[PDB]
Ligand binder design. Structure first.
Ligand SMILES: [Mg+2]
Ligand SMILES: [Mg+2]
Ligand SMILES: [Mg+2]
Ligand SMILES: [Mg+2]
Ligand SMILES: [Mg+2]
Ligand SMILES: [Mg+2]
Ligand SMILES: [Mg+2]
Ligand SMILES: [Mg+2]
Ligand SMILES: [Mg+2]
Ligand SMILES: [Mg+2]
Ligand SMILES: [Mg+2]
Ligand SMILES: [Mg+2]
Ligand SMILES: [Mg+2]
Ligand SMILES: [Mg+2]
Ligand SMILES: [Mg+2]
Ligand SMILES: [Mg+2]
Ligand SMILES: [Mg+2]
Ligand SMILES: [Mg+2]
Ligand SMILES: [Mg+2]
Ligand SMILES: [Mg+2]
Ligand SMILES: [Mg+2]
Ligand SMILES: [Mg+2]
Ligand SMILES: [Mg+2]
Ligand SMILES: [Mg+2]
Ligand SMILES: [Mg+2]
Ligand SMILES: [Mg+2]
Ligand SMILES: [Mg+2]
Ligand SMILES: [Mg+2]
Ligand SMILES: [Mg+2]
Ligand SMILES: [Mg+2]
Ligand SMILES: [Mg+2]
Ligand SMILES: [Mg+2]
Ligand SMILES: [Mg+2]
Ligand SMILES: [Mg+2]
Ligand SMILES: [Mg+2]
Ligand SMILES: [Mg+2]
Ligand SMILES: [Mg+2]
Ligand SMILES: [Mg+2]
Ligand SMILES: [Mg+2]
Ligand SMILES: [Mg+2]
Ligand SMILES: [Mg+2]
Ligand SMILES: [Mg+2]
Ligand SMILES: [Mg+2]
Ligand SMILES: [Mg+2]
Ligand SMILES: [Mg+2]
Lengths: 177, 208, 328, 132
RNA sequence: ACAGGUUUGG
RNA sequence: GCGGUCAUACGAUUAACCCAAAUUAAUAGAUCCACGGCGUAAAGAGUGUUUAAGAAAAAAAAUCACAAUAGAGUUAAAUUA
RNA sequence: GACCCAAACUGGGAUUAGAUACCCCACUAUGCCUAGCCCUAAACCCAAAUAGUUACAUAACAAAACUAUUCGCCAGAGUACUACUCGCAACUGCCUAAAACUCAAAGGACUUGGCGGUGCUUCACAUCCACCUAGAGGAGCCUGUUCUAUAAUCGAUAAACCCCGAUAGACCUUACCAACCCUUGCCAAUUCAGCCUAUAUACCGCCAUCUUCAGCAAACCCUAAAAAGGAACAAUAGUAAGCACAAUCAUAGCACAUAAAAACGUUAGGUCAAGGUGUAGCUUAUGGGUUGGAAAGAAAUGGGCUACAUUUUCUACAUAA
RNA sequence: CUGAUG
């Protein structure tokens, strides 16, 4: 993608190589933001349309106590929420994208609906993705099983640590008075 | 139409059921015919398990039946068979010993042979090509051949007879003529074959 | 509507006690077969549609399955698949896939250790098991369903049933199974009756085209028929009607082995011949073994003739023949 | 198109009663008759008298209770005494409702030379069955 | 020009 | 654009609006076209060269298989006297 | 000068109402060589030449949007590749090229329907053909229309009228006509009753047709704007109450079949004459009563019954006379 | 093949 040139290190005989210095520099901010929103009691939704790790993402969101969408994203889910989900529904406070493109190799619907609904979006972008609308892009690989598992475990430990430090802060809140 | 699509046709042949242990290919079919909860239609009043009836005679009687006078059609058929029997017996008793072994008195065999004799081989279909209908020679089916063979005889014996002559009296004569390959029904079949031979070159107009 | 149903259940219990009081039965043994029986008497509504009649049941059959609350007081949803639209169906699919992967890993480890202790527990033909229909799945999952997702769930259930089954997997796959009525069209055979020191006495009933025929058969007499007091030769002058009488007897080769007396009414000559044919065929089943009565029903003797004259329609001639339609 | 006893469907905002929401081909199937008598039997007589009396009761009650009648009347005829069941809106005070029922209970009796009963069931509003 | 009405089922 | 049977559009009445010793009509004026466009709406002229005239505002270049063109000679397939 | 072949024109032959066209045949100018003219093309890749850029940025479609130096053109549409000039071996020619007059439009692109004697797949189950049966159009009669004829109703009058309103006309019905009578004239009252007077192109009530077609549609949401559209199941922006369809119900058991049902709309479809009616018209009359007549067929036509026989006719009779 | 108009 044309918007991937600044996030690339080079080309190793046809295959583009993503640099890891900027990868880690973006991942630090992404993990900090997701940990802060999980600390402030924020709804976090792991979105990914990829028929290989959908079960891994559902199990990761279940172990995190956050919500997941790895299935066919309906049309008016985020925009027409008071008619798609229920009378009065609380929209997710963070959307984490484990695969930006769907099975048609086009940008996801939620990557535009979150920008339409003013919802922060963290997203793992490959060399063929479009990070223009993603709030926190992380230039990496989303097609290798260990690459997906590394990001899923990093976000798992981030949400776990955030909720645990929140419970500890409330424990001291109960002793301050 | 009151029968659903699941209703199957009944089997009247008693010999088909009397000896099932004589062949194994039929066993695998008749042991599962009833297992699938396959419903069977009611047997028609016209078709029964008698050995003195034939589907060809039943079809000819149904084609001769006007309106719904089936008793009248059956009377005409029985009187026709009796008339051909007596007309063959007269010639059996009037011929010598050499022709007695060649003359046939069984009415069913001569009826079937007359029908097979008037059965056409190929027919004509009107095909519209260039705004004009061409009579293309087409191979006929078995049911169409037998239906035409019966219909030609019935249509001839219904109109080309005198008012004083009765239906069985005319049909008995035309049956023997068709059995000996002399009747106008055989002439009509030959005319059909000659027209098909004259339009044999138009057989390329067919697409099936 | 969680509280409304709760109040309706209390009102229904009070109505049940009052109904048992006014009907005079013990309210303890008062069940639904007495509730509907008392409603049918107290409010005798004559209507053709059964759902329009007065009915008083427990509110859980009257009111449909209401969806439970999905989020707490703080707004956070309960289930982790709430933002998928179908949080029950997708959770069922997720559990099915999680058990499929568990069976896969356990069978891989068992093949690595070279042990085969599982069997084929998918063939449930003698039990008569089937899969759930879309309505049966829409009853379990309160939310609505579609066709493609139901076919995907069934195609995943067969994938799970095609693998070496575990212990807790069989009881999970069984709960989506339904047992199918009796797949047997075998008719009931009347036993041989003996009345007034008469041996081999049976009876049959037939009906075809507004013609009722009752035929009694004695298996000890000679071959002859007595209909309405007069013999069959004088009652059926036409050879076709007598051939209808010969049809069921010639099929069993019992021509000169049974005496029969029939009583036919209504219809015409061929309708009476077909009614007595069906009655004689249904009455001859007692004198014959089980293999030949099946050939009778496969030859068309034991089945009725539903071909009844259609009613003439207004504006037509013979219920099919239309009037002469003039184009201009 | 059939138009007898059929309220046409509007944009989806009109309130209709259970009797109006069903076509006339649903009588005795999903809904019943508004009147019950014996003149419409097989070997009975005096049917037209009951029809004209019923239509007079309808046209009389429509004017007697104006704007406050919820649905059509139920005219039961059982053993020389004729009962009229009505559904009335709570627009009139009971002081006037009792005056009206007491006036009609004797006017209809003296007009038809037969005992009449009049029963009123008052509803807060017209009961909606289909879309509203 | 601070512009408006006017082509067409639109 | 309105008038063929409820015309706020015609004629009259009531009422109302805007001007006002002026008000309308007609004709002249002032103003108004393009520092905009040229594939499909009007517009890239059928082609090349040159004169007049104009821009040279930072540096580079010129030329290669194949059916340009004009003459002279020849014919493999088909067809025909 | 050449001429194998093709072919304007032409002459025959087909088709057609006509065919001085498409189709077939023959043949000429011509296409061919030399020399001299003519200088026109949808001469279009409808995108000018020269050096560039991929910055800002999609009217629509199409070949994406643009810079700097220039040249040639463009001022509503028709008139008008026109008239009049100049020039040209062109003399039915080319180039350049107006005006009077008429109109408020002329145009380019697109959306949705409708249509297609356009391409391609799947179909027709009494339906198109391949095929079956019984009829109409021929005769007599019954009956309904169109016409002539009387003083003598009306409406329907393509599918969706024509034994239709009428499951029904000697008086009444009957609203038609000619003669005669009454005018607060059915009701408790009413400067009031009553009108079968006009308007079905004002209606309600009831129906016909597409139609056993499945679509109509409130509330939302999306589109680099939106006239409108909204789908990919290994799923790409769609959720959708409701009305239809379906299911159920009825033809006293199921199944089938039949019946019933069939939304929103099209035909300003039928009905002021079932009944009430908005508007416009009558009131000693377009209102209300009595008597008597409402023919007739020169003719055409629709639907039925009877037959035109031998599978017929008559008689007794269930069908063997 | 052919086959016009409102
Ligand atoms: Mg990738
Ligand atoms: Mg008939
Ligand atoms: Mg225009
Ligand atoms: Mg006026
Ligand atoms: Mg004006
Ligand atoms: Mg005026
Ligand atoms: Mg301009
Ligand atoms: Mg142009
Ligand atoms: Mg050019
Ligand atoms: Mg030019
Ligand atoms: Mg030369
Ligand atoms: Mg030569
Ligand atoms: Mg020549
Ligand atoms: Mg030639
Ligand atoms: Mg010619
Ligand atoms: Mg060219
Ligand atoms: Mg050009
Ligand atoms: Mg130039
Ligand atoms: Mg667009
Ligand atoms: Mg001009
Ligand atoms: Mg020119
Ligand atoms: Mg010129
Ligand atoms: Mg037909
Ligand atoms: Mg006839
Ligand atoms: Mg005739
Ligand atoms: Mg008339
Ligand atoms: Mg008329
Ligand atoms: Mg019509
Ligand atoms: Mg009179
Ligand atoms: Mg009269
Ligand atoms: Mg009058
Ligand atoms: Mg109309
Ligand atoms: Mg649908
Ligand atoms: Mg839309
Ligand atoms: Mg819906
Ligand atoms: Mg039933
Ligand atoms: Mg059905
Ligand atoms: Mg119907
Ligand atoms: Mg239905
Ligand atoms: Mg009209
Ligand atoms: Mg009319
Ligand atoms: Mg009227
Ligand atoms: Mg009228
Ligand atoms: Mg006539
Ligand atoms: Mg008719």
């Amino acid at each position: 993608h044309r918007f991937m040139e600044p996030y690339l290190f080079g080309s190793r005989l046809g295959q583009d190589i993503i640099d890891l210095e900027q990868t880690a520099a973006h991942l630090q901010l992404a993990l900090n933001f997701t940990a802060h929103v999980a600390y402030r009691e924020g709804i976090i939704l792991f979105v990914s349309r990829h028929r290989q790790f959908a079960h891994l993402i559902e199990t990761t969101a279940r172990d995190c106590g956050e919500y997941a969408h790895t299935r066919y994203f309906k049309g008016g889910l985020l925009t027409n929420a008071p008619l798609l989900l229920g009378p009065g529904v609380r929209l997710p406070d963070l959307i984490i994208f484990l695969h930006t493109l769907n099975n048609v190799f086009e940008p996801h619907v939620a990557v535009r609906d979150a920008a339409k609904m003013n919802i922060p979006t963290v997203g793992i972008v490959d060399t063929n993705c479009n990070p223009a609308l993603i709030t926190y892009p992380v230039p990496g690989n989303d097609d290798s099983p260990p690459a997906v598992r590394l990001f899923c475990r990093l976000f798992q430990v981030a949400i776990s640590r955030a909720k645990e430090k929140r419970r500890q802060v409330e424990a001291l809140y109960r002793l301050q008075g | 139409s009151r029968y659903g699509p699941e209703y199957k046709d009944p089997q009247i042949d008693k010999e088909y059921y009397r000896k099932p242990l004589a062949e194994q290919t039929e066993e695998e079919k008749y042991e599962r015919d009833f297992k699938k909860t396959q419903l069977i239609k009611a047997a028609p009043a016209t078709k029964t398990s008698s050995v003195f009836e034939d589907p060809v005679i039943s079809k000819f009687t149904n084609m001769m039946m006007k309106g719904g006078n089936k008793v009248l059609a059956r009377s005409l058929m029985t009187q026709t068979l009796e008339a051909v029997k007596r007309k063959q017996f007269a010639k059996y008793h009037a011929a010598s010993a050499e022709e007695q072994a060649t003359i046939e008195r069984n009415p069913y065999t001569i009826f079937h042979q007359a029908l097979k004799n008037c059965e056409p081989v190929i027919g004509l279909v009107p095909i519209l090509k260039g705004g004009h209908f061409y009579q293309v020679p087409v191979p006929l089916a078995d049911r169409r051949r037998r239906f035409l063979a019966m219909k030609w005889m019935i249509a001839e014996c219904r109109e080309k007879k005198h008012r004083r002559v009765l239906m069985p009296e005319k049909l008995s004569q035309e049956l023997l003529e068709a059995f000996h390959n002399q009747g106008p029904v055989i002439k009509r079949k030959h005319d059909m074959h000659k027209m098909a031979e004259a339009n044999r070159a138009l057989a390329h107009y067919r697409w099936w | 509507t969680v509280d409304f149903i709760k109040k309706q259940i209390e009102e229904f219990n009070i109505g049940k006690r009052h109904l048992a009081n006014m009907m005079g039965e013990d309210p303890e043994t008062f069940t639904q077969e007495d509730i509907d029986r008392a409603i049918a008497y107290l409010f005798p509504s004559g209507l053709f549609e059964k759902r329009a009649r007065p009915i008083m049941k427990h509110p859980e059959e009257i009111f449909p399955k209401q969806r439970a609350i999905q989020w707490g007081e703080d707004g956070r949803p309960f289930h982790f698949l709430f933002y998928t639209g179908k949080q029950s169906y997708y959770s069922l699919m997720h559990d099915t896939y999680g058990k499929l992967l568990d069976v896969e890993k356990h069978h891989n480890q068992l093949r690595a250790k070279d042990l085969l202790a599982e069997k084929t527990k998918i063939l449930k033909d003698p039990i008569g098991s089937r899969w759930l229909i879309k309505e049966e799945l829409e009853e379990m999952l309160v939310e609505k369903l579609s066709d493609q997702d139901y076919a995907q769930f069934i195609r995943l259930l067969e994938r799970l049933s095609a693998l070496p089954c575990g212990a807790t997997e069989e009881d999970f796959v069984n709960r989506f199974r339904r047992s199918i009525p009796i797949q047997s069209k075998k008719q009931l055979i009347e036993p041989l009756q003996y009345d007034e020191q008469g041996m081999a006495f049976s009876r049959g009933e037939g009906k075809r085209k507004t013609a009722k025929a009752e035929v009694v058969v004695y298996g000890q007499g000679s071959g002859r028929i007595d209909v309405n007091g007069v013999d069959y030769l004088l009652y059926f002058p036409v050879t076709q009607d007598r051939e209808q009488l010969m049809f069921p007897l010639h099929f069993l080769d019992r021509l000169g082995k049974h005496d029969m007396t029939c009583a036919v009414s209504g219809g015409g000559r061929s309708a009476q011949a077909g009614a007595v044919r069906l009655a004689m065929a249904r009455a001859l089943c007692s004198f014959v073994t089980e293999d030949e009565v099946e050939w009778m029903r496969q030859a068309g003797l034991l089945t009725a003739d539903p071909r009844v004259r259609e009613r003439k329609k207004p504006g037509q001639e013979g219920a099919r023949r239309k009037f002469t339609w003039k184009k201009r | 198109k059939n138009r007898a006893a059929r309220v046409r469907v509007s944009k989806g905002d009109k309130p209709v009663t259970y009797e109006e929401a069903h076509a006339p081909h649903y009588i005795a199937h999903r809904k019943g008759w508004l009147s019950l008598h014996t003149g419409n039997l097989d070997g009975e007589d005096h049917a037209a008298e009951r029809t004209v009396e019923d239509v007079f009761l309808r046209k009389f009650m429509l004017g007697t209770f104006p704007g406050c009648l919820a649905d059509q009347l139920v005219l039961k005829r059982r053993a020389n005494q004729l009962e009229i069941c009505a559904l009335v809106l709570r627009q009139l005070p009971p002081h006037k409702f009792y005056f009206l029922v007491g006036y009609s209970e004797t006017l209809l009796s003296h007009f038809y030379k037969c005992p009449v009963h009049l029963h009123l069931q008052t509803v807060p509003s017209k009961v909606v069955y289909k879309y509203i």
